[PDB]
Each structure stands twice: as structure tokens, then as C-alpha cells.
Amino acid sequence: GHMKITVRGSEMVYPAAETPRRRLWNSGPDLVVPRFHTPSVYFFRRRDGEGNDLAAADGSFFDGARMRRALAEALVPFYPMAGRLARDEDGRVEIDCNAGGVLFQEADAPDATVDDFGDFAPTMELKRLIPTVEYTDDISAFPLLVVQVTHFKCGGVAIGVGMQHHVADGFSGLHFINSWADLCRGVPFAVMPYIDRSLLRARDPPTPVYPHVEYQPAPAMLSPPAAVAIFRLSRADLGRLRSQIPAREGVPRLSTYAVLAAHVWRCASLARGLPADQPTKLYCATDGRQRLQPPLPEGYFGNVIFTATPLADAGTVTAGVAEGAAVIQAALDRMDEGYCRSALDYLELQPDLSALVRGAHTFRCPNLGLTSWVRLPIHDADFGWGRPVFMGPGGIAYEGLAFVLPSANRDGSLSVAISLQAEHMEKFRKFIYDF
Numbered sequence: 444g445h446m447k448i449t450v451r452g453s454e455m456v457y458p459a460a461e462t463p464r465r466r467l468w469n470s471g472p473d474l475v476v477p478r479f480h481t482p483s484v485y486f487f488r489r490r491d492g493e494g495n496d497l498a499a500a501d502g503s504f505f506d507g508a509r510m511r512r513a514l515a516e517a518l519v520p521f522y523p524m525a526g527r528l529a530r531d532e533d534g535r536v537e538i539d540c541n542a543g544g545v546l547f548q549e550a551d552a553p554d555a556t557v558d559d560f561g562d563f564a565p566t567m568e569l570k571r572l573i574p575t576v577e578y579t580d581d582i583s584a585f586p587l588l589v590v591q592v593t594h595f596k597c598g599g600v601a602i603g604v605g606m607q608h609h610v611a612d613g614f615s616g617l618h619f620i621n622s623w624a625d626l627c628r629g630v631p632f633a634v635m636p637y638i639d640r641s642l643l644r645a646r647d648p649p650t651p652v653y654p655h656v657e658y659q660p661a662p663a664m665l666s667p668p669a670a671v672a673i674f675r676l677s678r679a680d681l682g683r684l685r686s687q688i689p690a691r692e693g694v695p696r697l698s699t700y701a702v703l704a705a706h707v708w709r710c711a712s713l714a715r716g717l718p719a720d721q722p723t724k725l726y727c728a729t730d731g732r733q734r735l736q737p738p739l740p741e742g743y744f745g746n747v748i749f750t751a752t753p754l755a756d757a758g759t760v761t762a763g764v765a766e767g768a769a770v771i772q773a774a775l776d777r778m779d780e781g782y783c784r785s786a787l788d789y790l791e792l793q794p795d796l797s798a799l800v801r802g803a804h805t806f807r808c809p810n811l812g813l814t815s816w817v818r819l820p821i822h823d824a825d826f827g828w829g830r831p832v833f834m835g836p837g838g839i840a841y842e843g844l845a846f847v848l849p850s851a852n853r854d855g856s857l858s859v860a861i862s863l864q865a866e867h868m869e870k871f872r873k874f875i876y877d878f
């Protein structure tokens with residue numbers, strides 16, 4: 444259906460104090476992440492478990508003025524967020540820290556309730572909860588951060604975030620949002636951001652020592668409307684799925700990501716009807732912070748995304764989750780300090796990094812992307828009126844792109860949010876539970 448959603452006011456929000464005016468150099472990983480405003484949506488319920496109103500003692504519940512004041516404070520240490528994209532003399536995209544501000548707006552949905560969104564699948568209707576950005580040829584023209592706070596008939600609220608990917612990855616993006624939340628809640632946030640990105644500069648001279656398959660063009664089909672859905676697997680399902688894989692003494696244990704990813708990859712491949720000899724490539728975003736040595740400063744503010752790309756004939760992936768999980772874990776296992784360091788050097792040698800940008804052509808059939816949010820603090824944004832009951836991607840712009848989401852409660856379930864061709868989704872829906 445098409446929900447009535449009325450925007451009651453838009454406002455640019457600026458840092459509430461002096462911030463540095465500068466150009467901020469972007470690292471190779473900053474430049475190869477997707478070129479969108481990464482969409483996320485938060486839902487907050489007006490009543491708790493037992494039916495108590497979650498409004499504060501002063502009657503507030505996501506009061507706009509308060510949120511904007513806290514936002515302005517947050518933008519002082521996180522000042523690149525209030526910047527704009529630009530290019531350096533060489534044509535390399537950078538951030539112009541010019542305190543141009545972020546878009547904040549409020550909306551009302553007078554006839555819809557949080558419950559109407561059901562499972563919170565990242566449909567184009569869910570995307571309506573994030574402000575829309577008009578992309579022209581002037582890359583400096585739009586804010587890097589847009590936010591909408593939407594109020595519902597039930598008293599509940601959605602916060603829709605869109606964060607231009609050059610500025611921050613998951614950890615750094617949520618570091619900002621959660622810090623904003625902390626300020627709004629009336630507590631100082633624990634970790635000041637570290638802004639300079641030169642720590643991720645390549646070595647001089649660059650000395651790559653791997654082919655870096657992750658930056659090579661993805662396989663094409665050997666010589667359509669995209670559906671979106673979300674699927675929960677209970678702790679017991681994930682257990683049973685793991686128990687299907689032989690775990691023998693002396694064989695290193697597969698990660699839950701590798702097992703689940705093998706399952707998703709196998710199901711998508713079967714649903715797409717891939718022949719056994721069709722190559723297929725799975726794109727796995729990997730956090731460099733856990734891999735680089737010495738570790739980066741705790742508050743490093745930027746992208747530290749490296750990419751693991753298992754690649755196999757569809758025959759290997761569909762033969763079973765055991766075989767697919769092994770291929771994925773091997774690809775993950777490659778992602779150590781020396782590999783991530785080599786990748787920085789490799790990216791430095793490229794004449795034009797915009798060519799390596801991951802987008803529609805990257806994730807589309809016969810390939811796949813599976814971005815884990817399992818260890819991101821997506822449920823910690825408490826602005827003063829409680830923790831969210833759901834957080835997920837606002838939409839999924841590319842076919843073949845999927846997310847692993849952790850549960851908002853303690854049940855240890857995981858959900859897979861995914862986009863596939865409509866004809867293929869109909870099969871995927873059945874296959875993901877058909878084990």
C-alpha cells in the first residue's frame with residue numbers, strides 16, 4: 444500500500460561551534476564503497492513490553508528541537524559529517540569540511556502504525572522514511588547526511604538515516620548516530636572521533652603482493668523487476684543448519700557467517716537456476732579495524748572496509764552448504780593485516796578508483812553481496828525514549844545485495860534481508876527454509 448506521510452518541516456542543521464575548514468583526503472577504501480547514501484531505518488514503540496508510555500517525565504517523545512540541538516553538538520567533533528563532497532586537483536573525491544550542515548526533517552503518518560510495517564522488509568515504501576536526495580552532476584550540491592523523524596498513529600516513531608558512504612562505514616556511521624543519541628539522552632559519549640584518514644595511506648612505493656580478486660570485474664552470465672524480502676532464521680534453525688556440516692577433529696571451525704552465507708548463496712544460486720559451470724562471486728564486506736596492526740585509533744572516523752570475495756562454479760556452491768561454507772571461510776581467512784595492507788597499495792596504483800566502485804553491476808545475478816550487520820551496534824541508539832525495536836536497511840537499491848541482521852531481542856535469531864529478481868524470490872522464499 445501507499446502510506447500517507449506528511450513532512451511538517453525541513454531544516455539544515457549546523458555544528459554548534461567552531462569546526463575546521465579544510466579539505467579532508469579520502470583513503471582508497473573510502474572511494475570504493477557504494478555511491479549511495481547508505482539507508483537505515485530505526486523504529487521506536489511508544490509503549491514498552493507491559494504497556495507503559497515511553498514518553499519522558501516532561502512529556503517529550505522524540506522532541507525535534509532537542510534532537511536538533513544534540514545533532515548540532517554532535518557535528519562539532521564529527522565535523523566532516525556536516526561537509527560536502529568535492530574533488531582535489533587530480534580529480535580524486537575528497538570531503539570539503541565546510542560546515543554546510545545536515546538535513547533534518549520531521550514527518551507525520553496520521554493513519555499508519557508501526558505495526559503496519561510488519562516484518563520491516565526494506566521495501567521502497569520503507570525507503571520513504573528517509574529523505575530523498577536529488578543527485579545531479581554537482582557532487583557538492585547535497586548534504587552528506589539526511590534524517591527524517593516520522594511520527595505514527597500509534598505514537599511510535601521511525602528515524603530514517605541516509606549517510607553518504609564516503610564519510611563513514613557502519614562502525615563509524617553508527618559511532619556518529621549513537622553519539623548523537625547519547626547527547627540527546629543527556630550523557631557525554633565515550634569516544635571522540637579521530638578525523639585524519641592519512642593512517643590508511645598506501646605505502647611508498649606501493650607494493651601489492653596479492654592479485655586482489657575482490658577488485659576484479661565480477662563474473663558475467665555465460666552467453667527484471669527486483670523483489671525485496673526479509674527472512675528470519677531462529678537460533679535453533681541456525682544450529683540445525685550448522686549441525687549439517689561435518690565438524691571433524693583437526694578441522695578449523697566454520698564461522699556462523701560462513702555457514703549462513705553459504706546457505707544464502709546456495710539458495711540464491713538454485714533459485715536463479717544457475718548451471719553447474721556458471722561462475723559466481725559473493726561479496727563480503729570485512730571490517731579492517733579488527734585486522735590492521737597496529738590497530739587504528741579507537742575513534743577512527745571513516746571507511747575501513749576491505750572485501751572478501753569467494754568465487755566458485757555454481758556447481759560447488761549448490762552441491763551443498765558444507766562445500767560453499769569452506770570456500771567462504773577460506774576467502775575470509777585471507778583477510779589479515781598483510782592482505783588488507785596490500786589492498787591499500789593496490790588501490791593506490793589504480794588510475795581511476797570510480798571504476799572499482801561497487802554497484803548494481805557488482806552484485807547482480809549470478810553474483811551476490813552479503814553484508815553483515817551482526818556485530819554493528821544498530822540497536823544502541825537511545826535518544827532518551829528507549830532503544831529501538833527494529834533497525835535495518837532502509838531499502839536495497841541493487842539486485843543481489845543482502846544483509847545479515849541481528850535480533851533486536853535476545854533470542855539469538857538472525858535475519859537475511861535481500862533483493863532478488865521477482866521470479867527468483869518466489870523460489871528463494873521456499874529454499875531458505877528447505878533444509
Ligand SMILES: CC(C)(COP(=O)(O)OP(=O)(O)OC[C@H]1O[C@@H](n2cnc3c(N)ncnc32)[C@H](O)[C@@H]1OP(=O)(O)O)[C@@H](O)C(=O)NCCC(=O)NCCSC(=O)/C=C/c1ccc(O)cc1
Nearest residue numbers: 481483606612613616617698699700728729730815817818
Ligand atoms: C563480515 C565478517 C567477515 C563476518 O562476521 P559477522 O557476521 O560480522 O560476525 P563476527 O564473525 O565478526 O562475530 C560473530 C562471532 O563472534 C562471537 N561473538 C559475537 N559477539 C561477541 C561478543 N560481544 N563477545 C565475545 N564473542 C562474540 C559470536 O559467538 C560469533 O561466533 P561464531 O558463531 O563462532 O561465528 C566479519 O569478519 C566482519 O568483518 N564483520 C564486520 C563487517 C562490516 O563492517 N559490515 C559493515 C560494512 S559498512 C555498512 O554496511 C554500513 C552500514 C551503515 C549503517 C548505519 C549507518 O548510519 C551508516 C552505515
